[PDB]
Design a protein around this ligand. Structure first.
Ligand SMILES: CCCCCCCCCCCCC/C=C/[C@H](O)[C@H](N)CO
Ligand SMILES: CCCCCCCCCCCCC/C=C/[C@H](O)[C@H](N)CO
Lengths: 48, 296, 246, 96, 246, 296, 50
């Protein structure tokens, strides 16, 4: 969770709406086990 | 140095010696001759079961014995050679007829379905091993007929097939076995695939947090570190082949390691995942006799 | 010389005059999770004096027709002391235990208790329904009794299908009212994972079964209580966050 | 490799605005800005990143992760945030 | 190179981009009570990861006409986390603290906060009654505010008679909205006894006074909050018994 | 060895170097000559009070100075010689007349009763010292008259006298001073008698546990490690000697050690044990001027 | 904005213990990732009378 520690203080004539980009990644001790068919793709008929 | 109650125990909390060293025992133990001993104060027969230790009164200390170079073997008692024999695990029924327009069968991998092997592998609480699976496949009558079959392994997470010719059967990543019905049984080797360090057949606890009911506590004991996926089977075809098929699965446990033995179950089984029984019919382990002092 | 004994852990001590032995379960002492077996990367916490001490549960009155009791660990110590607070604030818990059960009686009473530990004491639902959707399952309070401890319904099968006769393969000890008056068992951390949760999974359970029923002549003392006391040894906690009771 | 996280995956948030969590001057303190579960195999934000689309080709994962938060606000606008990862237990916290 | 800074304690970390220094109070680090100064014979407990971390209190909104706030230590951490539980279960408590107060503002706002620590911050009753039987004394909630923290009534005298001008002799630090945005202070255990209670006597108090009032032009952000975060360092507890809240 | 996160910090938590070493300074600091320095990047005048550190811009770095072998003394600034001067502490009024049939006076030992010395010894928070008490005793008019007096010290716990000739005055164990009214003042030396390791004049806390009210919190701040007993005074006689007597007590603080300095109080005192004041009349430390840019 | 991913490891952020990680990474190499056969194409040979 990302909470407002204090606030988003801004001077005059500056937009009060900003954005934050969240990026994710794995650390250096990341490892994986048995393979598996992904569930993010679907196909009904052959791609002709 | 300034405060030393913190160093006195840090350098004292190393591996504490718990000597229970075993030795390589090839054959059963022999015996040594013994004469009669009329001595006071040294009693090997008087024991005390309240110490939690079993009696150590051997033969030589109780009766006058001869010596015997016992050459009997003990190799067939090791758990390796005890679980080295394959047994039935699960059977699937694939009715690819005209009235059953499904075409595929699905089996949740769970060896707790058949008592013969469950009773053995439940005498130990924590087991770690590699399995050797063998699939025999016949018709309902027991006939073999040259129809090619596909067995797919669906690990936890992968999409399960939805039809006879669905795309999941492409098995681009899932391991799969194509074999004809008129061929030797299909045999593969599967490793120790649990996320934990050992399979446990008894998990005294719940999988998740939260409030747990008291009427239908259907989630108690079900450990996820045991469920290892799914086994799907189909016949490789575009239209239905009208036949009733039956696939039996046998598993051999090799490179076995067992931990924390357990009493062997006496009451019959009633459920697969749960160790249920019935308090109305308690089957005593010992058969009944007429009298106590009348050994039959 | 061997009947007398004194255990001491933290700020607590236990004396005993008639108990004769200390059953070390499976011949291994409770130790810390070595680095070659640890999986959590964070640094755990080791109080070792706030939690490592003898907590004394309530007493259970042994009746002439009692049926036995069972406790779950570390379920009992989840609301008492700094152990309870650490277990409610931390996600990963690891510890061995030292059990000590006392049931004293005059030299005219007779009876025998079996005091054992059952690693992964999964209870069972007593009912002949074979469909998994209508079968009876033990309620939450029946499987995690808490500090109060629960009683058996048919101890001959240990409420788990298995017979009580073979239960002697477990780390056990008798309380025979003619020789000893208390039984003690030092059990290490028995689990298939380095650490585990302390509010979901109970490593083992304690079993006290009156095998030889209590018997006494008239005039003697009728109220014969049983008291259990537990000492978590070499305890570690990890994964700190807000307090979750269950 | 770092890859963006569809953490603003709400309805009525079509387009590239899914990759942006908004930040605004709050009149009430101790207020929540965003939240998401840290299970890459789960559906949600991680379903967009690379680690989360490649952890679905395997069954079991292990190891730590990291989450980089880049601020795209103005230069004169300042602030402080509190990023808190809570191990399993109850649901997400109510207050900070 | 000196503006950026990162503190890390336990499982928590704090970054900062504009604060430039770490005020070590009285030039001494928090350390454990050496054996040559200890009086309690029992063995204390030292978690060092369950309690040693950054607890973030609630935020106080700096208004144009605010008057300042004060906290008492370790009063604030008596109901939160394992620190709260250890302090409620143990009689003898010892620990240093690491304070960190953040109040960020744009480069157009102006103002200055004085962030200081007052060892033994005895408050005073504001009233001209000279007889000790009718004189006004500060209530319990006014002297031990808790996690909420209390506000001043006349900060020019620090509610303790002494003037605020000389309060700079204390371990202090400014928050000047033109240079820095947070102030941090590492204070050791300051007391006349090796250990002391954690629910009766508060070793010191934190003071945040808006000396130069907040001033900004129209259109800027009006809600300028102040957030304090505390890390008990090198903590020890002793004298374990039942839980006493106060 | 098996687990080393526990040893890596145990052998790293020794005394951490906090170097702030002082030096023996006999006299005030001199100065060294300095020319003009026209250099960029090296600015001793630009400071930053926000760091909590005081400015270190000395004289040589700012203006061109000569050298001076400063021989001024600094010995009269040490706290030893600052508290080495006795001051009034308490005064008791013994009216042994016919209408006052008590005969003895009692004084709770509390030096916080007279502002002159309280203001000094309250600029430091923790003090540890040995006291040197001196008792002058006169009549109400200031006369001396040959009447023998007895001063008894009643530590916390001992029974306080109940009459002019009660048994408590036997002082079999309590220290006592017998002296005539026409003799030099009685002077004794008292050690550091607190149970704690130092006297504290400010104790931000309560003495006991329990629920603390919000209307009359008369117990806040009162530390018991300060109260050091009682001082009883009588005139050695069986019948009343009709005279008004007044005993003044002066204390010298020797072998002093002070800790954690404190701002010196500005508002007047109102209570002995409590640091009360009045918000209605806040006496500002600086006198008022006409304008700001009009230094008088 | 430097185009480089964060290098903040665990030891530099929170207080960690030491762990002799024995987990395997062999099943992540592309060799063992593509070493599993999958369907590529299917042909339909209708050698009937029509
Ligand atoms: C294409 C090959 C398909 C056959 C291979 C399927 C994978 C077999 C995985 C077996 C997992 C270990 C053995 C199973 C143990 C128990 O059934 C579970 N712990 C729960 O009962
Ligand atoms: C027969 C000799 C009688 C005179 C000697 C009486 C004992 C004096 C004890 C003095 C104790 C230290 C000085 C007192 C300090 C403060 O008054 C207390 N901390 C409270 O105010």
């Amino acid at each position: 969770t990302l909470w407002y520690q204090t606030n988003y203080v801004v001077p005059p004539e500056t937009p009060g709406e900003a954005y934050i980009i969240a990026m994710g990644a794995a650390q250096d001790n990341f490892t994986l086990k048995i393979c598996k068919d992904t569930d993010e793709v679907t196909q009904q008929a052959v791609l002709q | 140095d300034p405060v030393e109650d913190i160093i006195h125990d840090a350098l004292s909390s190393t591996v504490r010696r718990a000597i229970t060293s075993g030795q390589d025992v090839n054959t059963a133990a022999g015996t040594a001759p013994s004469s009669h001993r009329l001595e006071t104060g040294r009693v090997p027969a008087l024991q005390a079961a309240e110490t939690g230790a079993t009696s150590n009164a051997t033969d030589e200390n109780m009766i006058e014995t001869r010596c015997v170079m016992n050459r009997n073997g003990v190799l067939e008692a090791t758990i390796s050679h005890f679980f080295s024999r394959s047994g039935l695990v699960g059977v699937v029924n694939l009715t690819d007829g005209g009235t059953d327009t499904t075409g595929y069968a699905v089996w949740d991998i769970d060896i707790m379905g058949f008592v013969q092997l469950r009773r053995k592998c439940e005498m130990f609480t924590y087991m770690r091993f590699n399995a050797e699976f063998t699939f025999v496949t016949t018709t309902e009558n027991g006939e073999a007929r040259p129809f090619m079959l596909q067995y797919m392994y669906v690990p936890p997470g992968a999409p399960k097939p939805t039809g006879r010719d669905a795309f999941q059967w492409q098995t681009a990543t899932n391991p799969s076995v194509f074999v004809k019905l008129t061929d030797p049984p299909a045999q593969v080797s599967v490793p120790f695939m649990s996320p934990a360090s050992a399979y446990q057949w008894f998990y005294d606890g719940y999988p998740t947090f939260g409030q747990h009911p008291e009427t239908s506590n259907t989630t108690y004991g079900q450990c996820p570190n045991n469920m290892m996926g799914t086994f799907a089977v189909r016949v490789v075809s575009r239209v239905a082949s009208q036949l009733k098929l039956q696939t039996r699965v046998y598993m051999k446990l090799k490179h076995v390691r067992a931990w924390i033995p357990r009493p062997i179950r006496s009451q019959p089984y009633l459920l697969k995942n749960f160790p249920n029984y019935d308090s109305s019919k308690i089957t005593y382990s010992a058969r009944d006799r007429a009298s106590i002092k009348q050994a039959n | 010389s061997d009947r007398v004994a004194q255990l001491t852990v933290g700020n607590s001590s236990i004396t005993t005059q008639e108990a004769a032995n200390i059953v070390l379960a499976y011949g291994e002492w409770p130790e810390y999770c070595p680095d070659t077996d640890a999986t959590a990367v964070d640094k755990p916490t080791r109080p070792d004096v706030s939690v490592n001490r003898f907590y004394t549960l309530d007493s259970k009155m042994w009746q002439e027709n009692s049926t036995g009791w069972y406790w779950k660990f570390p379920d009992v110590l989840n609301k008492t002391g700094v152990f309870g607070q650490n277990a409610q604030f931390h996600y990963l818990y690891r510890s061995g235990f030292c059990l000590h059960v006392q049931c004293n009686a005059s030299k005219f009473h007779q009876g025998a208790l079996l005091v054992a530990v059952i690693p992964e004491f999964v209870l069972a639902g007593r009912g002949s329904n074979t469909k998994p959707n209508e079968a009876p399952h033990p309620g939450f309070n029946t499987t995690f009794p808490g500090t109060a401890g629960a009683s058996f319904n048919d101890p001959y099968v240990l409420d788990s299908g298995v017979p009580l006769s073979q239960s002697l393969i477990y780390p056990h000890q008798w309380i025979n009212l003619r020789t000893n008056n208390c039984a003690t068992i030092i059990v290490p951390y028995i689990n298939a994972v380095p650490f585990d949760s302390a509010i979901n999974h109970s490593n083992f359970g304690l079993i006290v079964v009156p095998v030889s029923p209590l018997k006494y002549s008239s005039g003697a003392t009728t109220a014969i209580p049983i008291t259990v006391t537990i000492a978590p040894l070499n305890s570690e906690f990890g994964g700190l966050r807000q307090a979750v009771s269950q | 490799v770092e890859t963006i996280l569809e953490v603003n995956n709400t309805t009525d948030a079509t387009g590239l605005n899914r990759l942006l969590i908004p930040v605004s001057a709050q009149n009430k303190a101790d207020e929540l800005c965003a939240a998401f579960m840290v299970d890459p195999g789960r559906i949600g934000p991680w379903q967009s990143t690379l680690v989360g689309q490649i952890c679905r080709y395997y069954t079991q994962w292990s190891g730590s992760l990291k989450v980089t938060f880049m601020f795209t606000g103005s230069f004169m606008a300042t602030g402080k945030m509190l990023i808190a990862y809570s191990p399993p237990g109850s649901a997400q916290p109510a207050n900070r």
